[PDB]
Amino acid sequence: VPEFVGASEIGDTIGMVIPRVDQQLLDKLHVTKQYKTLGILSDRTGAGPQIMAMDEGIKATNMECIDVEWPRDTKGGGGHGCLIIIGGDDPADARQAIRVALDNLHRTFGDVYNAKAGHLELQFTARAAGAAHLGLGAVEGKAFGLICGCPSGIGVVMGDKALKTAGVEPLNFTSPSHGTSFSNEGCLTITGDSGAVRQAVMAGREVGLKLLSQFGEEPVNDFPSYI
Template sequence: DPKLHEMLGYDPKYRSIGILSSRTGAGPHILAVDEAVKATNTEVISIELARDTKGGAGHGSLIILGAEEVSDARRGIEVALKDLQRTFGDVYANDAGHIELQYTARASYACNKAFGAPIGRAFGLCVGAPAGIGVEMVDAAVKSADVDLLGISSPAKGTSFSNEVIGFFSGDAGAVRQAVVTAREIGVKLLGTLGSEPKTDGTPYI
């Protein structure tokens, strides 16, 4: 509806919108939408992170895609939903918390909007919850490879008060991948000391 679009501040050129909404997870959804905007005729209108309770210490998300045609908005959401299986591949959890890793060789508009990732460059992120694990992961990651540390989010800054520390990395593909892999190693190890062996429900892709 035009009244709704105007209230939400959407550009009127988007005659259709696509909605991706989740109780659990934000990183996987943003990375999946990043692929969707590369592959379809859609743009990212907004990305919001909820402090939901289903995901334990982490976020839920609400992502709005804009398109001029209904078929494009639908296609964008289809591509994103399909890619979610991949982007949940490096989320490891146990009763004590969770860690998450994401990597793309070429960041697009969703990663740019959500994380300030330079478009077209390799981008990675690591999440640790409880937050102290995230501090150790980011520290190990930036020591292990020559990456640009774009930013750090923590319970009071850049998150919706989630119990996470999140690091964002840009740079050469090999270096970003190395940083993320190092963060995964230290994160799985630390989270494992607080509970059972952290498991992913999917297939690691990084």
């Protein structure tokens, strides 16, 4: 079908574009602004990595991020899936943004670490765009970090360490009962100077790996770290 753009085994992620959406359907979608041309990125496993990949798609095109929704999923693991809707006036521009997001998944899964007992996720950008803003609460135009661990108490200690490492501005802390879809994740989000934000995210990574390893298995990443 013409609406299909591509699919990836990374997170069971599918990208599609609707050139002219039915108006009655559009009136039922919870979007920030209606556009007739929609891009759709949808996955079983991952929230942060697809959101950061879509930020690159936004930087590369005239598309706007208009909805981010939050399935509890990861196919039985402890985290989220993701639905991201983008909007613009040009179907070609929408396909390009979805293609760029698909091509960035192997990078944004760079600091996702898996084990039988749980997982860690780290994200970093020197300049956040629209998807990171709508999806993760980033301040647009500024540095952003994300520091997350599962089961959730690991994320609390990762967060304590990150804040003690450098002078950064906390945006939010989300947990199983507040700001997640009852996931088993503790997540610190921050802004500040880019060098300080990087320092804090790297500190969180080191303590998170040490703690998750105490269940007996070295946490494994499937792609090279970008941070």
